[PDB]
Write a protein that binds this DNA or RNA. Structure first.
Ligand SMILES: [Zn+2]
Lengths: 60, 127, 98, 206, 155, 140
RNA sequence: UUCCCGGGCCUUGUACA
RNA sequence: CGUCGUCAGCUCGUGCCGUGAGGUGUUGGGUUAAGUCCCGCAACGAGCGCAACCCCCGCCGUUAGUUGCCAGCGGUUCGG
């Protein structure tokens, strides 16, 4: 999550297959979610904070 | 004319209509012998009838949905018991002891994280 | 002849909005089909609790959206003028259909 | 131990989301990202004001920001200069003609975030940690507040070793769903590291 | 089980014959949750028995089971760092369990190709008073009564 | 048969040295007694009512008669000084004069005003207490 | 519930920066 | 975040005991999944825990009938 990598991720990389996704909050490139654009850790933090509307702890 | 019972067992749901007749049962527009064919256990679905010396009086229309064949059989059994009770409350006094008015509450237990399937833990060795 | 589709993350506000719409419509002449509860859609996210390891923690989150139906029949002119003008709570979304 | 977030635990009941709006699969992440930007900007801007909570709402291409502040005077400025400049700043941050709204919190001693922020200020000003926590808890408990509990992380007073301080008074039943427990976190940046301040305030039942 | 007595499950009586012992035997046959297969195998074996033997298959099965019920078992016990096979009397429950399990194992160990054939043969032989099941019962009994020296370890 | 308080079920440790703490229990008793006289009990599901009633009856059992003490008593009357040695010790500690109906197995030193008599024999207790109470009555 | 492992209680001999 | 451990335990205010560390409460007997409850007791109460409050499955009810259902009932021709 070097600054250079974060910036490089946001340009048209001369190809489609060179494109990938990063956590829009911390720049993590590993375990992001398409729906939110957040990594797992940031997903958990923001879901606990109550800043993700309609999202709650599940129990079935 | 029509005496109706529901019955439920493990994702299978029945609807039984009992009408006066010769004692012929149909399931989803098919016959019992041809729907549950090759299944030994099938005839179980009819014990609540023959418990009270039925099978001479009531033709049954059966609509069954969801679950599996065995679950469907149990649903049919519960439905028939309920319909017979509705026919005459006194029937309840003799159906209930034999254990037919009970809906089996046992269903598939949900999987747990960190287990192979809901109870089975991962193997470990070489302590 | 005119169809109202209601979406929302919450069910309280969704029910309140559905009741308000159906009441305003029924009071305005034409008959109402009423609030039909459509099946809700649930998305499940399972995320490891720990930031580094311990892959056996796996907190579960769900996001559920509810769906309603109203389906007003024989649209009155005063009805069609009162609709598309009502104010919604912060969560509820309305889709219009014919 | 590893207690879970007492707000996430009660999002369903006794607590409400900070953001209330619906979005489809297509437009969820964009709305969320701009919300993140808005919260970041206001947090940076309105620190002096005593910010406690930010609420974002959307109806139809409209944003209704509601900011709960100890001192609304700081937010407005004189003749509504500051509020207007903030409104235009937000509008040009996100092109959705936002509507900034200001609320004043009654008895800021009953606001968990404000209490945590105040204690963090005390820490950054090199006050006695134990005395600060004790005074904060006493002050909170004096203003009703059926229960209170304040925790400070570690590295107390430029020490070599980290250690949790922590003080409580009253009832803090974390395990009950119908608790209406208010939680606040503050980060104190000291020349010798960082400290965490957690505040729990138990305000009635049901 | 440290506290309770672990009450035995009540099995649903058979449908063809209306007895619980047949149900237990079917269960003892059934593998991988295939119960229909076990029922078909058992009924094929019963038909074979009836076709090749005078009386009803039910009596043959029942009296074979009664014929393969041991009474003395040896249990491994630790005394003074030594392992002793203490003789014990087996309750009817354990009797029936051992009988059915041994019958099934002996049937499955036969050289006949078809499962129904093997089951029928084992049942007929155990009825007569010979075969793998009866032999194992006899060996179990003789392993006891040959070490009655340790019976005073009441256990 | 007087305005005097009494303890006859059990002497809780610190009825005198820890007077303030026990007074809280007295207040709890009065508040619960008020609550069960109210129709507002219909909330708090029946088993919660059960536990509340158990608490109330325990309080009545141990604190009936003790309810009359608004403050520290001016004297104490002990039937058996040996039996209620805890009460005697407390009263000694708090400079409260002690009157006791002692017998052969008692310590004469710890009693300020001793009546050398019997601690058993209902008749003796009846006579002594009756005379004392009548004297209190006609003294008022 | 005799033995294998672990935890708790009652009773008991050595060591805790 | 893992772990001991979903194991039942960890403390506090006033009182009492001991010069003091500390003890009692929280040692005893019955019963619990549980410091769960009861009885006694120099202690009387409380806080964090346990349990409950929240959710899912199992029975029934009111509200509502579309894109879901078809017991009635009129063509169908297989098809709700
Ligand atoms: Zn992230």
């Amino acid at each position: 999550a070097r600054k250079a990598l974060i910036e490089k991720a946001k340009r048209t990389p001369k190809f489609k297959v060179r494109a990938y996704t990063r956590c829009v909050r911390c720049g993590r490139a590993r375990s992001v979610y398409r729906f939110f654009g957040l990594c797992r850790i940031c997903l958990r933090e923001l879901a606990h904070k109550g800043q993700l509307p309609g999202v709650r702890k599940a129990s079935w | 004319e029509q005496y109706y019972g529901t019955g439920r067992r493990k994702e299978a749901v029945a609807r039984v209509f009992l009408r006066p007749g010769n004692g012929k049962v149909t399931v989803n527009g098919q016959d019992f012998n041809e729907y549950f064919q090759g299944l030994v256990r099938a005839v179980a679905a009819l014990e609540p009838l023959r418990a009270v010396d039925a099978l001479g009086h009531f033709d049954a229309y059966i609509t069954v949905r969801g679950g599996g064949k065995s679950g469907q059989i149990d649903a049919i059994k519960l439905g028939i018991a309920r319909a017979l009770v509705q026919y005459n409350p006194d029937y309840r006094a003799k159906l209930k002891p034999l254990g037919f008015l009970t809906r089996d509450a046992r269903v598939v237990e949900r999987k747990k994280y960190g287990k192979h399937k809901a109870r089975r833990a991962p193997q470990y060795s070489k302590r | 002849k005119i169809r109202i589709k209601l979406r929302g993350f919450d069910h309280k506000t969704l029910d309140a909005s559905a009741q308000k719409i159906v009441e305003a419509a029924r009071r305005s002449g034409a008959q109402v089909s009423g609030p039909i509860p459509l099946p809700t859609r649930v998305r499940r996210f399972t995320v490891i609790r720990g930031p580094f390891k311990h892959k056996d923690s796996r907190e579960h989150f769900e996001l559920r959206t509810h769906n309603r139906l109203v389906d007003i029949i024989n649209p009155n002119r005063k009805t069609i003028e009162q609709l598309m003008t009502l104010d919604l709570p912060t969560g509820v979304e309305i889709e219009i259909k014919t | 131990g590893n207690k879970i977030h007492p707000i996430g635990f009660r999002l369903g009941i006794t607590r409400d989301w900070e953001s209330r709006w619906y979005a489809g699969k297509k437009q969820y992440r964009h709305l969320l990202l701009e919300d993140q930007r808005i919260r970041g900007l206001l947090e940076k801007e309105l620190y002096s004001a005593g910010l406690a909570r930010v609420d974002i709402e959307r109806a139809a291409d409209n944003v209704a920001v509601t900011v709960h502040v100890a001192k609304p005077g700081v937010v407005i400025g004189r003749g509504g200069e500051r509020i207007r400049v903030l409104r235009e700043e937000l509008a040009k941050l996100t092109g959705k003609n936002v509507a900034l709204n200001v609320q004043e919190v009654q008895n800021p001693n009953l606001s968990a975030p404000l209490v945590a922020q105040r204690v963090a200020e005390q820490i950054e000003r090199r006050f006695a940690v134990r005395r600060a926590i004790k005074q904060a808890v006493q002050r909170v408990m004096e203003s009703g507040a059926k229960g209170a509990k304040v925790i400070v992380s570690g590295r107390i007073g430029g020490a070599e070793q980290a250690r949790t301080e922590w003080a409580a008074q009253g009832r803090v039943p974390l395990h009950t769903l119908r608790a209406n427990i208010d939680y606040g976190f503050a980060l104190a940046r000291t020349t010798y590291g960082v400290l965490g301040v957690k505040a729990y305030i138990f305000l009635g039942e049901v | 089980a440290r506290r309770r007595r672990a009450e035995v499950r009540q099995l649903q009586p058979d449908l063809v014959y209306g007895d619980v012992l047949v149900t237990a035997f079917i269960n003892k046959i059934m593998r991988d949750g295939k119960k229909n297969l076990a029922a078909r195998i058992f009924y094929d074996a019963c038909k074979i028995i009836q076709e090749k033997t005078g009386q009803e298959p039910l009596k043959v099965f029942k009296q074979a089971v009664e014929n393969v019920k041991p009474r003395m078992e040896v249990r491994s016990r630790r005394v003074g760092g030594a392992n002793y096979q203490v003789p014990m009397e087996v309750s009817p429950r354990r009797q029936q369990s051992l009988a059915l399990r041994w019958l099934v194992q002996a049937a499955n160990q036969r050289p006949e190709r078809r499962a129904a054939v093997r089951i029928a043969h084992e049942l007929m032989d155990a009825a007569e008073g010979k075969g793998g099941a009866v032999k194992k019962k006899e060996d179990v009994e003789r392993m006891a009564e040959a070490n009655r020296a340790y019976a005073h370890y009441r256990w | 048969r007087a305005g005097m308080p009494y303890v006859n079920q059990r002497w809780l440790g610190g009825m005198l040295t820890n007077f303030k703490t026990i007074s809280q229990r007295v207040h709890r008793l009065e508040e619960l007694e008020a609550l069960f006289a109210s129709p507002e009990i219909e909330e708090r599901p029946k088993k919660e009512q059960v536990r509340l009633k158990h608490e109330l009856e325990r309080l009545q059992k141990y604190l009936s008669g003790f309810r009359l003490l608004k403050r520290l008593p001016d004297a104490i009357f002990v039937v058996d000084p040996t039996k209620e040695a805890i009460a005697v010790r407390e009263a000694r500690k708090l400079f409260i004069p002690v009157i006791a109906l002692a017998d052969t197995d008692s310590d004469p030193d710890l009693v300020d005003y001793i009546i050398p008599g019997n601690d058993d024999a209902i008749r003796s207790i009846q006579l002594i207490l009756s005379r004392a109470v009548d004297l209190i009555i006609q003294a008022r």
